[PDB]
Amino acid sequence: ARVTVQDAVEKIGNRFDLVLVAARRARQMQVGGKDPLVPEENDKTTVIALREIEEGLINNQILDVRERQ
Amino acid sequence: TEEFDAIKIALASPDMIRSWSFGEVKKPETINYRTFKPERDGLFCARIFGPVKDYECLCGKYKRLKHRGVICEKCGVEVTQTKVRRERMGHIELASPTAHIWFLKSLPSRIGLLLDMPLRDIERVLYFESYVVIEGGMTNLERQQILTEEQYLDALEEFGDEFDAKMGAEAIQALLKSMDLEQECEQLREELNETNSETKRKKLTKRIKLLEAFVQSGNKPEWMILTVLPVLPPDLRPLVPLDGGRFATSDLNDLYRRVINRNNRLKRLLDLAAPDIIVRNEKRMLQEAVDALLDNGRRGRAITGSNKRPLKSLADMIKGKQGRFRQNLLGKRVDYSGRSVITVGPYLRLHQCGLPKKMALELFKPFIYGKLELRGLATTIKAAKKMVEREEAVVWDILDEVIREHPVLLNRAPTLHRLGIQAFEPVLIEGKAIQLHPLVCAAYNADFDGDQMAVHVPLTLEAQLEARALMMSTNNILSPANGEPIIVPSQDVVLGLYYMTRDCVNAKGEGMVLTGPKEAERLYRSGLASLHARVKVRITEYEKDANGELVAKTSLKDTTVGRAILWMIVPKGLPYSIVNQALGKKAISKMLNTCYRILGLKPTVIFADQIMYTGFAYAARSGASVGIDDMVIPEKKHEIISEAEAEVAEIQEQFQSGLVTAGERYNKVIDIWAAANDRVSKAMMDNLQTETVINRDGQEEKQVSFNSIYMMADSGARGSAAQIRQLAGMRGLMAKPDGSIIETPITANFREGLNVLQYFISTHGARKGLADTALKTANSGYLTRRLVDVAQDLVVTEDDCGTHEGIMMTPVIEGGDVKEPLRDRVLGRVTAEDVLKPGTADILVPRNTLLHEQWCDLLEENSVDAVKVRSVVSCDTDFGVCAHCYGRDLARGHIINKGEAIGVIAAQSIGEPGTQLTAESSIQVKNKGSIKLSNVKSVVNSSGKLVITSRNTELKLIDEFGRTKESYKVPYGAVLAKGDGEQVAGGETVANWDPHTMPVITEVSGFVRFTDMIDGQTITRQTDELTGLSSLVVLDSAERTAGGKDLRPALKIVDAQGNDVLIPGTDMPAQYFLPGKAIVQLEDGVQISSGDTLARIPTGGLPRVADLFEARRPKEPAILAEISGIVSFGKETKGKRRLVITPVDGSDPYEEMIPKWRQLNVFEGERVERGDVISDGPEAPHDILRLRGVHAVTRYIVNEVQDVYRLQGVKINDKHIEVIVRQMLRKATIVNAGSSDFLEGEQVEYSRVKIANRELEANGKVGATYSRDLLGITKASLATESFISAASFQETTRVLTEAAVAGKRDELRGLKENVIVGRLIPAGTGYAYHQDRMRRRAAG
Amino acid sequence: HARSTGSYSLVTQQPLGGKAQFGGQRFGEMEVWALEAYGAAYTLQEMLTVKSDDVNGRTKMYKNIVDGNHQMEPGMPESFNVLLKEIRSLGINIELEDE
Ligand SMILES: [Mg+2]
Ligand SMILES: [Zn+2]
Ligand SMILES: [Zn+2]
């Protein structure tokens, strides 16, 4: 289990819209419109989206560019 | 559903009501009672309101969902979902315009005062007993003239024309439409400019405000009278058919049927042109029916058909507890939740929790079904239920698979603070008990004695993400109240670690040299060396001294095996020194503190877990127990007891002879018994503490004992010195019911045996204690509820307001020493401006910087004493606070994030800890330093003393390196020894004064001359013989004799020749008005020396905190000065003596009444400063705020609350109290004019926005100067801006009517409004959502 | 004791209280304040509508879970809409604004 989200909050310092972007990503992941960019280790889609956020691949702007594309 | 905000309320116009309505309900029938099909227009009609059952017509021709717009040819009902029958409204067209009961009969009658005509008259008019002449043209009669029958008759016969009068709501509407708003408003403004009298000016200002509210909102008065009346959807007032041909109906059905009946009868009577009397009666009857519908109870209380119970009107459904809001959105039972008993489970990780199989299956049932169907193990859902009720291996595998990362919420019944709910990852276990991680118990206040815990499951995805990010246990290690760690090891862990680190003089493996910890473990685990034995070990510590690089330093330290074994866990960054000591509770706590501050979160978590495991393991290996011989009775107890008994016997016998009162004997016995108790306690502690005299190789030695009970005491695991005393010493003195202390103490202890009396006494004690705790808890709960209620809406909205204002914060040095240092007091606050070294142009801190540990450390090496820091109270932001003014402090370390609701966290942090709260002759410098006098003006006399002539004189202490250690307040008349500059040795007497005596000191010499000092009228000469004793008494205002009440005796100080000698440097003729109780001992005939004595002048805890927060005037307030300058007396003896403060510069006319009993501390001819004490006693916050201003009152509140809280040793950060105070003073009162009504209580927010407007306008205004007001939290909360939040709990009818008439607009801005409306709170995760909607307006 | 879903009460459609009948835990006002101290807005949202009182909401959430997706569909609580109709039933114009 991912015991700390400290690096994800260091990516976006509000610590609140972090939850929103991670929820949007994990909702695009659960209802299978999209695919994970990280090799999953039997995590559920919430911890997958946090693991993706902490690695710098996804934020709000990447979501907006990919959605309009 | 639209995404909205800003809920608007106003009078409904008849055309808008026509807009909402879908049809007219013409007949009152509902259903045929024979065939249960509904009738035509009726009250229940399918073609108007909707189909009764989903997607199927009445006659049963069309039943399929395939049809969605077809309208059955037989029954004209369209096929749609029956839910629409729940929202469609109807309407009834009334023939006679009818009044709205709420806007007329509501206690402040808005029709009444709008027309400036009393309510009695309106009632007189409405019931048709008398007429009123409304605009009777060019005759001799006014507009609110009451007319009798035959006076109306003779008027009509005389005046055929130019006579217009009418009756009822139509007449009232006529009066309202023809009223000229602006002409009356301007006339009223002129009148107010001409009129000066309190009550009429108040009624006029209320009325003008009402008119203004109408002219801005745009509501026209005529809408208060109803013409069309809407009718509620049928399903909300159902008419259900009971089994057995009978029907059950809501009362609204009865009221609607009666209203429709009476309306139709009135229609026919109108069509028949019936006489006026009958139509008037019918219109009245329709009034009762309608107003009973709207609000039943303001009339003859129209009861229902054949039931004697009063029927429920609309207002009853809305208003009141049982109806709606107060109960509807307040405290419900939720789903997917369970509850059970908690258990230890040490093997768990900090971020996990043991969950029973069966509970997990029950909770996650629907997840199980979904996943089972996804995997194809089950064709359909019923097969999933059958497979779950068999419970095959596949079910447990799927349950295991779904559970991996899904977090659950744990809650414990009294959720005092936000750490009462936390999320954990579950691990499936056998059994029916929940397993809870030990470290978090302290946070929950959980105990394993039958306490139970509740477990909730977050359903939606956003909830899951929120739980894992914000609420998870590992993310909450710091308490939101104060910064210190919460998860510190509690009792077993600390005991084990204590055992591990303590060393022994001689053991197995003394003095061998080890190459590292690994062979230390080899040695200990193989039994070739004792777990604690002094040894030389080579160790490599790491230090990140560079920019994040670790440098290995490797050397030989002298330690124990145990300390090395412990060192194995310790993360890289920490110095070895940390573990080298005894390692008790405090040591472990500060270890965790340093580990967190240096390394960060994750290493701290893992290190805490490691500490737990090793502590538990080695505590178990230790084998610590408690035997009867472990508590050693001190050998010299019996002697002490016999001696104290002999002493009490001697004092009692010497009492029976009668040389000492009973009270004195009581005091003596109590004090000697206390001394004996302290003696025995100290002897027992000496015996037990260091008694192990064990031998090394040769001679012997002694060391800190290994007595198991002593280790439990010293480690801080359990027990304090007091309980050790209670076990092995005498258990001290006891208190009887009233609080008085029994003369004979309890000499026995629990190791020995008590006897009946002593036991009985302790029983009383324990009973009283427990009852106290009970009532304390009740009072706490009540206090915290008020706090959280009042401060809920405050949210951090802006990043930085950009103000330069701030409060100068100093370390509070109460008397002897520095109770609380600066560093902790300033940590995490941003600075208001750069502070300079003791040498100018040496900037130490740039403009606003967050003061983290490094800056704080920097400040201690230098000598900064006081720092101006931005405070929340002075923050400039409108409708919330800015991040910078607040600071950092959180469960996390960084500056506050925009959006967090700090009000609620502050209220909880101040409330929850509130459940464990129940001579001065000479100054003595404690530490060697220079003495410095502040705020004083002394005059050296002949004796060579620095005579103190100021009542507000302070004596602080500068140390070697420029810091104020000690501070004392030196009163007027205290003999001084050392002046300024002198270095004072340790504990040397620097000042002297009489404790129960304040002498009045003369500055010059000469003969005492009597002025207005007449003998007999106001003073009574009782004088003694030659030696110069007297009893001349200059009495105070209360105690002055009956003849000398107004005659004020005075003493002018003249010299031997006669001329009044003048005070040095000033020309003032010294005319000393002798104050109250001026005992003139030295009679006339003795050359006065400089310093002759002229006049001798002789709760806490929860209720105190609640009282500070409710701002209650403490019945004896001290009095202050407004301006400086010569005070003077005035018109004498009216029953309260008058004092008029005369400013040397400013205007005179400030009079203050003074009761007779009050004694004055200042002389008439004295130089007062503003806000100096005039009478002694507790000051009410209002005066301090008004005179000294905001920062003074906020400092006052913070110091008195923080005193109570620290007295119990509970640490709370000041920011929360500051936030509360800021919420307290939201309101101001206008003193100047220009845009307001010159006196209205208005919130500071509206004042700030209007001043910003005015001063932005180039012409603008002179501008509105204001004065702050302080309101108590209960009333202050009651004065809530939001109409929704007000309606949430007070009289609903009143606020709803007020907001409806005022056209008020609610942006909801708060927590409770958003809850009520069922949308996302604007705090935290939903802030962004709302932020999005704010971006959504005025965008593309 | 634990419950996932079960019988609800007659008049106010909240789950029964008790142990004999399944019965849910009492989410009191103090717990609301605790959650509010955190930024937990969505948890409160489900707690107020989807978890207890909203009939259509609870069945929709059941169906969504059964389908193997874990989302939810937001909006104004119907009880709130009922409130609008009841206040509007008086002579009071209360409008849902838009921008
Ligand atoms: Mg317990
Ligand atoms: Zn049909
Ligand atoms: Zn600010």
JSON list of C-alpha atoms in Angstrom, two decimals, chain B residues 148-275:
[
{"chain": "B", "resi": 148, "resn": "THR", "atom": "CA", "xyz": [-68.44, 54.11, 12.89]},
{"chain": "B", "resi": 149, "resn": "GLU", "atom": "CA", "xyz": [-71.56, 52.80, 11.15]},
{"chain": "B", "resi": 150, "resn": "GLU", "atom": "CA", "xyz": [-73.81, 55.86, 11.31]},
{"chain": "B", "resi": 151, "resn": "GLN", "atom": "CA", "xyz": [-70.94, 58.34, 11.08]},
{"chain": "B", "resi": 152, "resn": "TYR", "atom": "CA", "xyz": [-70.17, 56.59, 7.79]},
{"chain": "B", "resi": 153, "resn": "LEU", "atom": "CA", "xyz": [-73.89, 56.92, 7.03]},
{"chain": "B", "resi": 154, "resn": "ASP", "atom": "CA", "xyz": [-74.15, 60.68, 7.65]},
{"chain": "B", "resi": 155, "resn": "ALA", "atom": "CA", "xyz": [-70.88, 61.13, 5.77]},
{"chain": "B", "resi": 156, "resn": "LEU", "atom": "CA", "xyz": [-72.20, 59.28, 2.71]},
{"chain": "B", "resi": 157, "resn": "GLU", "atom": "CA", "xyz": [-75.47, 61.23, 2.72]},
{"chain": "B", "resi": 158, "resn": "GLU", "atom": "CA", "xyz": [-73.55, 64.50, 3.09]},
{"chain": "B", "resi": 159, "resn": "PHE", "atom": "CA", "xyz": [-70.68, 63.59, 0.74]},
{"chain": "B", "resi": 160, "resn": "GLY", "atom": "CA", "xyz": [-71.97, 61.58, -2.21]},
{"chain": "B", "resi": 161, "resn": "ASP", "atom": "CA", "xyz": [-68.70, 62.03, -4.15]},
{"chain": "B", "resi": 162, "resn": "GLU", "atom": "CA", "xyz": [-65.09, 62.80, -3.08]},
{"chain": "B", "resi": 163, "resn": "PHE", "atom": "CA", "xyz": [-65.55, 59.90, -0.64]},
{"chain": "B", "resi": 164, "resn": "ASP", "atom": "CA", "xyz": [-63.47, 56.77, -1.32]},
{"chain": "B", "resi": 165, "resn": "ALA", "atom": "CA", "xyz": [-63.38, 54.03, 1.32]},
{"chain": "B", "resi": 166, "resn": "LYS", "atom": "CA", "xyz": [-63.08, 50.26, 1.03]},
{"chain": "B", "resi": 167, "resn": "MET", "atom": "CA", "xyz": [-62.54, 47.06, 3.03]},
{"chain": "B", "resi": 168, "resn": "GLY", "atom": "CA", "xyz": [-60.13, 44.17, 3.19]},
{"chain": "B", "resi": 169, "resn": "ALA", "atom": "CA", "xyz": [-56.96, 43.12, 1.44]},
{"chain": "B", "resi": 170, "resn": "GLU", "atom": "CA", "xyz": [-58.10, 44.93, -1.71]},
{"chain": "B", "resi": 171, "resn": "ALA", "atom": "CA", "xyz": [-58.38, 48.17, 0.27]},
{"chain": "B", "resi": 172, "resn": "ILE", "atom": "CA", "xyz": [-54.94, 47.55, 1.75]},
{"chain": "B", "resi": 173, "resn": "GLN", "atom": "CA", "xyz": [-53.49, 46.89, -1.71]},
{"chain": "B", "resi": 174, "resn": "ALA", "atom": "CA", "xyz": [-55.08, 50.13, -2.94]},
{"chain": "B", "resi": 175, "resn": "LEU", "atom": "CA", "xyz": [-53.43, 51.97, -0.05]},
{"chain": "B", "resi": 176, "resn": "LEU", "atom": "CA", "xyz": [-50.08, 50.38, -0.86]},
{"chain": "B", "resi": 177, "resn": "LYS", "atom": "CA", "xyz": [-50.04, 51.05, -4.61]},
{"chain": "B", "resi": 178, "resn": "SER", "atom": "CA", "xyz": [-50.91, 54.74, -4.22]},
{"chain": "B", "resi": 179, "resn": "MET", "atom": "CA", "xyz": [-48.23, 55.39, -1.58]},
{"chain": "B", "resi": 180, "resn": "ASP", "atom": "CA", "xyz": [-45.39, 57.64, -2.81]},
{"chain": "B", "resi": 181, "resn": "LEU", "atom": "CA", "xyz": [-42.13, 55.99, -1.76]},
{"chain": "B", "resi": 182, "resn": "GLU", "atom": "CA", "xyz": [-39.65, 58.80, -2.46]},
{"chain": "B", "resi": 183, "resn": "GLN", "atom": "CA", "xyz": [-41.70, 61.74, -1.18]},
{"chain": "B", "resi": 184, "resn": "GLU", "atom": "CA", "xyz": [-42.23, 60.10, 2.22]},
{"chain": "B", "resi": 185, "resn": "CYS", "atom": "CA", "xyz": [-38.58, 58.97, 2.31]},
{"chain": "B", "resi": 186, "resn": "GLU", "atom": "CA", "xyz": [-37.29, 62.50, 1.73]},
{"chain": "B", "resi": 187, "resn": "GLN", "atom": "CA", "xyz": [-39.83, 64.03, 4.14]},
{"chain": "B", "resi": 188, "resn": "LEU", "atom": "CA", "xyz": [-38.71, 61.49, 6.74]},
{"chain": "B", "resi": 189, "resn": "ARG", "atom": "CA", "xyz": [-35.06, 62.35, 6.17]},
{"chain": "B", "resi": 190, "resn": "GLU", "atom": "CA", "xyz": [-35.85, 66.03, 6.72]},
{"chain": "B", "resi": 191, "resn": "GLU", "atom": "CA", "xyz": [-37.81, 65.18, 9.87]},
{"chain": "B", "resi": 192, "resn": "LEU", "atom": "CA", "xyz": [-34.87, 63.14, 11.19]},
{"chain": "B", "resi": 193, "resn": "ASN", "atom": "CA", "xyz": [-32.62, 66.12, 10.46]},
{"chain": "B", "resi": 194, "resn": "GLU", "atom": "CA", "xyz": [-34.99, 68.20, 12.61]},
{"chain": "B", "resi": 195, "resn": "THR", "atom": "CA", "xyz": [-35.90, 65.72, 15.39]},
{"chain": "B", "resi": 196, "resn": "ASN", "atom": "CA", "xyz": [-33.69, 64.86, 18.40]},
{"chain": "B", "resi": 197, "resn": "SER", "atom": "CA", "xyz": [-35.34, 62.26, 20.65]},
{"chain": "B", "resi": 198, "resn": "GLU", "atom": "CA", "xyz": [-34.32, 58.64, 21.22]},
{"chain": "B", "resi": 199, "resn": "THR", "atom": "CA", "xyz": [-37.38, 56.45, 20.69]},
{"chain": "B", "resi": 200, "resn": "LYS", "atom": "CA", "xyz": [-38.98, 58.38, 17.85]},
{"chain": "B", "resi": 201, "resn": "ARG", "atom": "CA", "xyz": [-35.60, 58.58, 16.10]},
{"chain": "B", "resi": 202, "resn": "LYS", "atom": "CA", "xyz": [-35.27, 54.79, 16.41]},
{"chain": "B", "resi": 203, "resn": "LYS", "atom": "CA", "xyz": [-38.74, 54.04, 15.02]},
{"chain": "B", "resi": 204, "resn": "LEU", "atom": "CA", "xyz": [-38.06, 56.51, 12.21]},
{"chain": "B", "resi": 205, "resn": "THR", "atom": "CA", "xyz": [-34.71, 54.93, 11.34]},
{"chain": "B", "resi": 206, "resn": "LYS", "atom": "CA", "xyz": [-36.24, 51.43, 11.28]},
{"chain": "B", "resi": 207, "resn": "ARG", "atom": "CA", "xyz": [-39.01, 52.68, 8.99]},
{"chain": "B", "resi": 208, "resn": "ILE", "atom": "CA", "xyz": [-36.62, 54.50, 6.65]},
{"chain": "B", "resi": 209, "resn": "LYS", "atom": "CA", "xyz": [-34.52, 51.34, 6.43]},
{"chain": "B", "resi": 210, "resn": "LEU", "atom": "CA", "xyz": [-37.58, 49.27, 5.52]},
{"chain": "B", "resi": 211, "resn": "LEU", "atom": "CA", "xyz": [-38.45, 51.74, 2.75]},
{"chain": "B", "resi": 212, "resn": "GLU", "atom": "CA", "xyz": [-34.87, 51.69, 1.49]},
{"chain": "B", "resi": 213, "resn": "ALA", "atom": "CA", "xyz": [-34.91, 47.89, 1.44]},
{"chain": "B", "resi": 214, "resn": "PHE", "atom": "CA", "xyz": [-37.94, 48.01, -0.82]},
{"chain": "B", "resi": 215, "resn": "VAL", "atom": "CA", "xyz": [-36.45, 50.62, -3.13]},
{"chain": "B", "resi": 216, "resn": "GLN", "atom": "CA", "xyz": [-33.18, 48.73, -3.64]},
{"chain": "B", "resi": 217, "resn": "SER", "atom": "CA", "xyz": [-34.64, 45.22, -3.86]},
{"chain": "B", "resi": 218, "resn": "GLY", "atom": "CA", "xyz": [-37.35, 46.28, -6.31]},
{"chain": "B", "resi": 219, "resn": "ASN", "atom": "CA", "xyz": [-40.30, 44.59, -4.62]},
{"chain": "B", "resi": 220, "resn": "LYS", "atom": "CA", "xyz": [-43.60, 46.42, -4.79]},
{"chain": "B", "resi": 221, "resn": "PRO", "atom": "CA", "xyz": [-45.80, 46.22, -1.70]},
{"chain": "B", "resi": 222, "resn": "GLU", "atom": "CA", "xyz": [-48.95, 45.05, -3.51]},
{"chain": "B", "resi": 223, "resn": "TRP", "atom": "CA", "xyz": [-47.46, 41.57, -3.89]},
{"chain": "B", "resi": 224, "resn": "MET", "atom": "CA", "xyz": [-48.00, 41.01, -0.18]},
{"chain": "B", "resi": 225, "resn": "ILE", "atom": "CA", "xyz": [-51.70, 40.64, -1.05]},
{"chain": "B", "resi": 226, "resn": "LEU", "atom": "CA", "xyz": [-52.45, 37.35, -2.80]},
{"chain": "B", "resi": 227, "resn": "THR", "atom": "CA", "xyz": [-54.62, 37.16, -5.91]},
{"chain": "B", "resi": 228, "resn": "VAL", "atom": "CA", "xyz": [-53.71, 33.70, -7.26]},
{"chain": "B", "resi": 229, "resn": "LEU", "atom": "CA", "xyz": [-52.96, 30.89, -4.81]},
{"chain": "B", "resi": 230, "resn": "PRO", "atom": "CA", "xyz": [-50.78, 27.90, -5.79]},
{"chain": "B", "resi": 231, "resn": "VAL", "atom": "CA", "xyz": [-51.74, 24.34, -4.87]},
{"chain": "B", "resi": 232, "resn": "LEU", "atom": "CA", "xyz": [-49.21, 21.70, -3.79]},
{"chain": "B", "resi": 233, "resn": "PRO", "atom": "CA", "xyz": [-48.53, 18.55, -5.86]},
{"chain": "B", "resi": 234, "resn": "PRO", "atom": "CA", "xyz": [-50.83, 15.69, -4.83]},
{"chain": "B", "resi": 235, "resn": "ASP", "atom": "CA", "xyz": [-48.19, 13.18, -3.66]},
{"chain": "B", "resi": 236, "resn": "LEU", "atom": "CA", "xyz": [-46.89, 15.59, -1.03]},
{"chain": "B", "resi": 237, "resn": "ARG", "atom": "CA", "xyz": [-50.39, 15.73, 0.51]},
{"chain": "B", "resi": 238, "resn": "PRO", "atom": "CA", "xyz": [-51.45, 12.20, -0.37]},
{"chain": "B", "resi": 239, "resn": "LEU", "atom": "CA", "xyz": [-54.94, 10.68, -0.22]},
{"chain": "B", "resi": 240, "resn": "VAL", "atom": "CA", "xyz": [-53.91, 7.04, 0.06]},
{"chain": "B", "resi": 241, "resn": "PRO", "atom": "CA", "xyz": [-56.70, 4.42, -0.12]},
{"chain": "B", "resi": 242, "resn": "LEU", "atom": "CA", "xyz": [-56.62, 2.27, 3.01]},
{"chain": "B", "resi": 243, "resn": "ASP", "atom": "CA", "xyz": [-57.32, -1.44, 2.60]},
{"chain": "B", "resi": 244, "resn": "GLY", "atom": "CA", "xyz": [-61.04, -1.73, 3.31]},
{"chain": "B", "resi": 245, "resn": "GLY", "atom": "CA", "xyz": [-62.60, 0.91, 1.09]},
{"chain": "B", "resi": 246, "resn": "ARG", "atom": "CA", "xyz": [-61.63, 3.60, 3.59]},
{"chain": "B", "resi": 247, "resn": "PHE", "atom": "CA", "xyz": [-59.13, 6.36, 2.84]},
{"chain": "B", "resi": 248, "resn": "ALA", "atom": "CA", "xyz": [-56.32, 8.01, 4.81]},
{"chain": "B", "resi": 249, "resn": "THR", "atom": "CA", "xyz": [-55.48, 11.62, 4.00]},
{"chain": "B", "resi": 250, "resn": "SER", "atom": "CA", "xyz": [-53.10, 14.34, 5.09]},
{"chain": "B", "resi": 251, "resn": "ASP", "atom": "CA", "xyz": [-54.67, 17.44, 6.58]},
{"chain": "B", "resi": 252, "resn": "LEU", "atom": "CA", "xyz": [-53.59, 19.51, 3.57]},
{"chain": "B", "resi": 253, "resn": "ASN", "atom": "CA", "xyz": [-56.20, 17.58, 1.56]},
{"chain": "B", "resi": 254, "resn": "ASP", "atom": "CA", "xyz": [-58.88, 18.70, 4.01]},
{"chain": "B", "resi": 255, "resn": "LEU", "atom": "CA", "xyz": [-57.72, 22.31, 3.95]},
{"chain": "B", "resi": 256, "resn": "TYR", "atom": "CA", "xyz": [-57.56, 22.44, 0.16]},
{"chain": "B", "resi": 257, "resn": "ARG", "atom": "CA", "xyz": [-61.03, 20.89, -0.15]},
{"chain": "B", "resi": 258, "resn": "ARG", "atom": "CA", "xyz": [-62.47, 23.40, 2.33]},
{"chain": "B", "resi": 259, "resn": "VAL", "atom": "CA", "xyz": [-60.74, 26.32, 0.61]},
{"chain": "B", "resi": 260, "resn": "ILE", "atom": "CA", "xyz": [-62.01, 25.25, -2.81]},
{"chain": "B", "resi": 261, "resn": "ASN", "atom": "CA", "xyz": [-65.53, 24.75, -1.43]},
{"chain": "B", "resi": 262, "resn": "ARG", "atom": "CA", "xyz": [-65.62, 28.17, 0.21]},
{"chain": "B", "resi": 263, "resn": "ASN", "atom": "CA", "xyz": [-64.13, 29.79, -2.91]},
{"chain": "B", "resi": 264, "resn": "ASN", "atom": "CA", "xyz": [-66.78, 28.25, -5.18]},
{"chain": "B", "resi": 265, "resn": "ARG", "atom": "CA", "xyz": [-69.57, 29.25, -2.79]},
{"chain": "B", "resi": 266, "resn": "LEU", "atom": "CA", "xyz": [-68.21, 32.80, -2.85]},
{"chain": "B", "resi": 267, "resn": "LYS", "atom": "CA", "xyz": [-68.12, 32.64, -6.66]},
{"chain": "B", "resi": 268, "resn": "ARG", "atom": "CA", "xyz": [-71.81, 31.68, -6.82]},
{"chain": "B", "resi": 269, "resn": "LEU", "atom": "CA", "xyz": [-72.75, 34.34, -4.28]},
{"chain": "B", "resi": 270, "resn": "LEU", "atom": "CA", "xyz": [-70.94, 36.94, -6.39]},
{"chain": "B", "resi": 271, "resn": "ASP", "atom": "CA", "xyz": [-72.71, 35.70, -9.53]},
{"chain": "B", "resi": 272, "resn": "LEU", "atom": "CA", "xyz": [-75.99, 36.07, -7.61]},
{"chain": "B", "resi": 273, "resn": "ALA", "atom": "CA", "xyz": [-75.20, 39.66, -6.50]},
{"chain": "B", "resi": 274, "resn": "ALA", "atom": "CA", "xyz": [-75.89, 38.91, -2.84]},
{"chain": "B", "resi": 275, "resn": "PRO", "atom": "CA", "xyz": [-75.99, 41.82, -0.36]}
]
